[PDB]
């Protein structure tokens with residue numbers, strides 16, 4: 615495509631190697647197009663981003679590239695290549711290339727009903743991927759159907775680590791009604807109560823939500839706003855026990871819970887009468903109110919529902935658990951640009 619190829623009025627400079635573009639979507643420094651990788655003879659997915667004007671966007675870009683490049687797993691999308699100018703001065707945009715995944719669980723569910731065998735396989739892959747992520751001491755933090763890529767062969771890959779953090783269980787407590795950025799419907803109850811979401815159990819809850827969703831094609835706790843989300847959860851799980859309340863020390867959070875009328879638990883087999891009993895048993899253990907009593911990823915994999923797939927020797931863990939040296943977003947966009955430039959250097963044809 616002549617000098618710089620063009621896509622819907624925007625320059626999509628993916629050089630020679632990648633051709634036959636095609637628009638897919640675009641929300642900010644994020645326009646995605648599928649192209650043809652002349653080198654591997656396969657159409658890929660490419661995302662154009664320009665986060666250098668804003669320090670924040672530089673943080674999510676740096677952080678996610680590092681994670682995604684460090685991670686190597688069959689159930690986590692990998693970066694196949696990264697395009698950028700040869701000089702930091704000339705680098706305005708950055709193109710990241712990933713395998714082309716036709717669809718995702720969000721689109722699948724808004725059209726198809728899944729058999730129990732597909733839900734099982736999908737769940738297996740989700741957890742197989744999460745076990746690796748967690749083994750690297752990283753928390754995804756934004757797991758939801760739209761963040762689970764799927765190809766024509768049922769192959770599932772977790773993507774979107776823009777909100778991922780290095781686990782930090784000790785510094786997880788915060789006040790009641792503390793703002794959160796992760797997608798509302800899949801947020802664990804403790805996030806609206808006292809958690810910063812720096813604990814692994816936060817991802818398991820999201821997976822539990824995805825499970826319920828696969829079972830009924832509808833989001834289980836579709837809260838309209840912050841506190842609505844919580845009443846949605848309590849509506850089905852019912853009022854928290856004394857025990858689980860005695861854990862919540864943040865006085866305000868506990869008093870809020872106590873002020874609420876008593877609500878009984880709604881049986882799962884009632885919510886999902888077509889569901890498989892083993893599935894609903896694992897769902898129960900995932901959607902546990904108390905984070906400390908919530909099942910772990912490895913325990914989930916070893917659950918009877920996933921019996922036909924479970925194979926610990928075939929469920930790899932990270933070789934090098936993560937450590938974010940520039941942890942805590944205190945870096946100017948300048949320094950961040952140098953790090954991104956440096957992090958993407960390995961793909962340079964120079």
Ligand SMILES: Nc1nccc(-c2c(-c3ccc(F)cc3)ncn2C2CCNCC2)n1
Nearest residue numbers: 646659660661710711712713714715718760
């Ligand atoms: N692998 C793949 N395949 C198809 C689409 C996407 C993709 C990208 C993206 C990100 C980084 C990158 F380097 C290349 C593409 N951003 C959003 N989505 C989709 C993710 C699921 N819902 C609709 C948009 N990713």
